[PDB]
Symmetry: D2
Subunit: 456 residues, 4 copies
């Protein structure tokens, strides 16, 4: 059966209405194709819901991301490639939040500064496609906000009812993320006890034992110095997703009050969003929509990026020079990061703006296995981050963070790591609805390796 | 042409067998006020709810339990409040924010006046159902049972009992709860900000002069904390818990979950809310609501009206608090202001004698409802104040703790209850009578009442 | 047969040459009220003091400076108090504890009433000297100049000026300061405990009824903090700073030390105290006290009596606050209650006009001293209250900050000042007139005055 | 010249007066010989002074020492062998406090629990002697509370005026210890920066670099976790001295209020005191005076101690079984600690009392050099602590702490350590008025070594 929602029956200031209309009249790639009257109806509903986030959390994220930009904190961004309606369950959510928290404790120690924790959750329900027609000859699956994963024509029709289903799934998950992080799951001592169990049972546990012991002693030190533990009991986890579907993003806009300067438009589907490689057209609607909202935004930069084009994103998206307003996410592939990134970094640094430089070591290293599965090699992922570190150290700039696809589940999607996942093993638990994710073990292992990168 | 959007539903281990076996035994009891829809459809919706993200988590409920234990011991005070009936249509950011705001305002004043913590519980995120007296409504239509069951609109189609609503209810509850959590951790519940709203109310209210001393005195108490250099993090956020009447057993049972036993034994919680209560209509001693309440580990409350006997109250205590956990059980009295002074004392004496430690909570609003000449179901402010007054006098005389209050309020400037300082009359009621069920004290009246009760606490 | 014990003295780099050269230039100025003892003996005692452990350290003084800057800006309030003249004989644990206690009691009340922090400064640990008018005392003996200089006892031998006292003074100052630090970090200065003493005073005082509302209101302010879950460490201890009139330049100069320049440039501090002031007798503009004050980095104060002109006050400001550091300089007014309203305004206007930010502090006690029929030098409570009243009215009218008070008090139940709620009369004075110099408000009177001044702060 | 104090011109409850009189009528070894009328006069003065400590600090020390006794904190006790009137100066005091704080940070890290810091200060002005007549043929110097260090008959006369001079010097120093620890000298970050400078310049700095870096990262971790730093800004340092001169100790008694049970006698010359080898007669006045006061007390136990005698001290001095009330200080010599301590520990553990076991690795290892100077070898000191650790690990009991003689000054009194102080070097800066102390460098080095003992 179905559940069914009623379509409901003070205007923006003029300049925001004009700028917003202007931004949305620009070309927009990768949009779903569904009737405009039905999309309007869905938007009317989403214009009336409880937002997923609120403005003052977003100004707080901004301030924390400014610290990152200045070289005083570090950003960790992670979760599923594609969340699905069917896996939006308590265990799946709790496990991803847990996977992210584990990595955080280790990176916090290794960087010797705060880690801003941003999950890819409560909203990554859509994806772009290079091909409208997939390898089975079906209309491509573009994520659950648009259509269905199942391989059949009917399920692949673009269905606007999904926009509301997506909000409903986002809100519920977010509710649970908030409950879990303020309720004990994000207690530092508890999270660190899970890291100890992993060191104990991982096949490469011995390799990571020193670092884990040193973290354990750091914690006991705090306790020994009688420091208050209130701040150890909870953590903040922000939500993020690629802003891809403009029907969804525009219905989730809300105007803030003037309790901070003038009223502004915030996208309250998330705390921060980014724009992918296939929608980053400089004169396109995604970049223009990003210029209009006050959220922190990110732009993915791949191997054809030029230094001049990167400067142009910075001048469009960070025109007031607010450190941390903009994050540039490098995804070049490991074999190319060392050569392609430096000139982009030098040129952007020369502008006097303060962007966060973030490494996406996953997307630029995807390949197909002999066994059929889309996959990435652990060592290639590690090595991109390694080269990202080297590029920054040579230029004296801040390696700001990482952006990774992970899960808390024990899936077999990426080859290698300590568990030595082979081409054979991939068939066991290849569960992603899109790209291959790091395992819970692999995601934690990578945090150990990166901590070392931070320590040297 | 329907003005509706259909949202498809797409059909985790079950609860363990020993718990399922106890739970089956309990829900075999008869259940009053249940929705009349097909069992096979109800099952299907329950199956969906059995696998969604819960609205609350167990360790928030163990923390509420501990705070309610302090209430039961006379060391905190319980404030419980919100809409009589939430609807899907008004489950919006501004309505939610205004109710949360109204509850916080009252809390600052009651905190000061009681000189002890206030456990703040709001009736939101799941209060979408109601019982009925009447088979058929005055319009000759099947009665409205709340949005979890059917539609308010006066037409046959909307009044059919629609199990899809079980899911729509969960979706609305989860979204509202999300927003309550955001707002209370993000600045809306900053003490200084909330108190500035109380100051604007004092400057503005027609009776502002009456409340001025208390407001100034609270202001100085705040400025003192700052002066002493102890204005810490704790002033910037507050906890607001969720509660609703547990009425629809299909909803409540599908939202049961087992705690993971990392901080005790594995237990059964209803994760549709932090705490729930059982209304007058469904509190049959051998009925399924009371048995459901015994089974879950959440704190629970039972409403007690004018026909309550002391022996029946004792039986609730022995059924629902059998392990003697202070604060596990709250007894709410809604006897009407003219009767509270006579009816409550013997009930209190008898329950005290059992050696259990219940929270005694006053529901002033329910026992004092009447119809106006102008049509509208309404309650009079002075009757509400006066029931709380008498509730305080009863406890004073017995040396027991007046534990808290349970009120129906909103942040909106509605005209549903007569009186208060704005002097709402019978003809004013027509202006903004917006409730989908009982009349709710408006934002000014709800705050005024908190001043009056603070005075009660102090003397 | 002497009733005395001789304690032998046994004779670190010097201060740097550039500072010594400036300091020599300054102390070549003439110095009023100095002790008449041999220079070679004074040198020897100074040599001993140049190498003892200081009484205070520089970073406490930089912290006092910052807190006094908040006073000067209208964001805190300064309370300064203790004995007129400490003696060696009464420099005991119970006397010290009772004075510290009296000051803390007043502070809680003034904190509440001012709704802002109180910088607590006590006249102890070094206030062992006094100026004189009279060559010869009424007994035909050389005058008593305080225990740093000679003996109180009425006999020629004791009245000889004895430089050994410089060391005895340091030893007593250091021991008393040790005990002040212990007591304030160890529980005597717990806010809840101090306030319970104020409650016992209210229950007991003959005017207790008059002060009851304010005391209850403070109690509720405290209970609020606890209710809000912010009753932190900061309520358990308080800082009390030391101060005395810098009169004897042999003492003060030997206690100079250079800060180590790990938190700024190297500077010269007088580490006999945190802050010192210069009295009416020694404030000559071209004299050595004012020049000594300019040279040290401590906060300093200057007493201003009824002959002060606005131009002379401006000159103090330009000499002592030449870098415009708010709170570096405090101007204290002791003009008598009958004259404060007329004399102070023009002084304030003129100093404000300079663009400097001084602390304006009231010394109610000094300008209101008289002799009773019964013999005793005394002050009347009502005159003291009334000078502070007028000091408040002056500042109100000009829109300037009444910055604080400077009072002579003790924790003992002495009978030195007439009036207050105990209604001390001329014949009661004989009972316990124990001061070695001016009359001091007793513990009840000192607390009563804090209530009255809190009322002044609030309106 | 001299300064001169006037002799001044509510009784104890009867039972305390009786118990106290009883205790002082017992034999008392090592007392000064000076006229009783003059001693009375001095006592009359000291009965009237501001105490050096107050009772509620002593109940707080007690509670913290109970944690030590239970295996949950660790005790560090240290300072000069003999303080003198002439070296009671701001730099000397600040340096000893600093030396103790440096060791503390390192031991706090290494033990992973709190360190109770107790200085031997504001009162160790007296010492016992084995010989009344020293090697020069003079009346022995017994410390500045009794007589003068200078080698001449006159200065060695026992002078009761010194009792008051001692209080005056104690009070002043204590004042300064309180000021310094609440004012910034005991800021953790500042103390740890001194440890970094020492690692950088010590000849064995490389050996200690790992541990120092690991502490540095532990501190930055706290900062990275946003923990409140108020408790990092100050430390508590308690005062202690051997209770040797009963004329001094008895004049510094004060009766507490009944704000905690019944009124009791506290010795307010210090927070805690101990009884040396030469005054610990079981039926002597020192042990009996210790039974009467409520302060935490310690008893030094040397190589002739039997297990039965140790049990008897425990039953006399800890008769109510208050954990931490009594500390037994082992000083056996390194060659003997392994053999002599175990049976003493087993027997005392069997009583069910909970004493603190503390190692004094200095006294049992003193020897004379060819060059004339009384001295101890660094390696012997380290090795006693090593064997003290081994004895406890084998029995599963808590190595509770150490008691050492140190200074902040760069003296040459103990041979060895990284600076490799030789017999020749001793002549340079042999400044102690009694036993040889560890250097600032040597004292810190020993804290590194002990941290390792704690870590393994
Ligand atoms: N203040 C918190 C500390 C914290 C609590 N849990 C975790 C888990 C992982 C890293 C850090 C923390 C914070 O840093 O967000
Ligand atoms: N610790 C919070 C104090 C608080 C913060 N905001 C409000 C609003 C209303 C009452 C109290 C508070 C608490 O007591 O819950
Ligand atoms: N933080 C302290 C508060 C305090 C503690 N004891 C007292 C006694 C009197 C006044 C204040 C306090 C302070 O304000 O200094
Ligand atoms: N709470 C303090 C922490 C501390 C501050 N300074 C130091 C110096 C050495 C060791 C510890 C500390 C404490 O542990 O006493
Ligand atoms: N798994 C979710 C269940 C859900 C229903 C309604 C709201 C939120 C979640 C879905 O299929 O949409
Ligand atoms: N007003 C809500 C809007 C809503 C839709 C979906 C989920 C949550 C809320 C409703 O009509 O159901
Ligand atoms: N009353 C003090 C006692 C004292 C003696 C020595 C030092 C400190 C205080 C005196 O007569 O000097
Ligand atoms: N060095 C101290 C100086 C001193 C004098 C008086 C009191 C305290 C210390 C002495 O010789 O006694
Ligand atoms: Mn992906
Ligand atoms: Mn109702
Ligand atoms: Mn005076
Ligand atoms: Mn020694």
């Amino acid at each position: 059966m179905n559940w069914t929602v009623d379509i409901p029956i003070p205007p923006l200031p003029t300049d925001l209405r004009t700028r917003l209309d202007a931004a949305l009249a620009k070309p927009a790639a990768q949009q779903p194709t569904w009737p405009a009257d039905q999309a309007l109806a869905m938007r009317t509903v989403l214009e009336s819901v409880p937002p997923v986030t609120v403005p003052s959390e977003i100004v707080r994220l901004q301030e924390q991301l400014a610290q990152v930009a200045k070289g005083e904190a570090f950003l960790l961004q992670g979760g599923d490639c594609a969340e699905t309606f069917m896996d939006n369950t308590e265990p799946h959510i709790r496990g991803n939040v847990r996977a992210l928290l584990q990595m955080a404790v280790v990176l916090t120690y290794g960087a010797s500064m705060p880690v801003v924790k941003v999950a890819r959750i409560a909203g990554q329900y859509a994806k772009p496609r290079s091909a409208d027609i997939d390898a089975l000859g079906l209309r491509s699956y573009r994520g659950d906000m648009i259509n269905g994963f199942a391989p059949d024509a009917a399920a692949r029709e673009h269905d606007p009812s999904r926009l509301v289903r997506a909000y409903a799934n986002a809100s519920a998950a977010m509710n649970l993320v908030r409950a879990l992080t303020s309720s004990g799951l994000a207690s530092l001592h508890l999270v660190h006890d899970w890291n100890r169990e992993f060191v104990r049972t991982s096949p490469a546990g011995a390799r990571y034992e020193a670092l884990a012991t040193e973290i354990d002693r750091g914690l006991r030190f705090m306790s020994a110095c009688g420091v208050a533990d209130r701040n150890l009991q909870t953590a903040e986890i922000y939500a993020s997703h690629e802003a891809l579907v403009l029907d969804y993003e525009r219905a989730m806009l809300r105007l803030s009050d003037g309790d901070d300067g003038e009223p502004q438009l915030f996208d309250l589907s998330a705390h921060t969003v980014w724009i992918g490689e296939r929608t980053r057209q400089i004169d396109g609607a995604h970049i223009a929509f990003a210029q209009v909202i006050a959220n922190p935004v990110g732009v993915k930069l791949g191997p054809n990026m030029t230094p001049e084009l990167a400067v142009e994103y910075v001048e469009r998206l960070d025109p007031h020079n607010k450190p941390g307003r903009l994050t540039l996410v490098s995804r070049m592939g490991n074999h190319k990061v060392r050569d392609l990134l430096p000139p982009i970094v030098e040129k952007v640094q020369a502008t006097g703006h303060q962007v966060i430089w973030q490494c996406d070591p996953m997307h630029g290293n995807t390949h197909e296995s002999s066994t059929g599965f889309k996959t990435r090699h652990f060592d290639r992922i590690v090595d991109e981050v390694q080269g990202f570190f080297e590029v920054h150290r040579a230029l004296g700039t801040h390696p700001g963070g990482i952006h990774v696809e992970i899960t808390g589940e024990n899936v077999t999607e990426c080859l290698g790591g300590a568990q030595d996942i082979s081409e054979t093993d991939l068939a066991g638990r290849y569960e992603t609805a899109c790209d291959p994710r790091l395992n819970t073990q692999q995601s934690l292992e990578l945090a150990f390796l990166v901590a070392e990168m931070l320590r040297d």
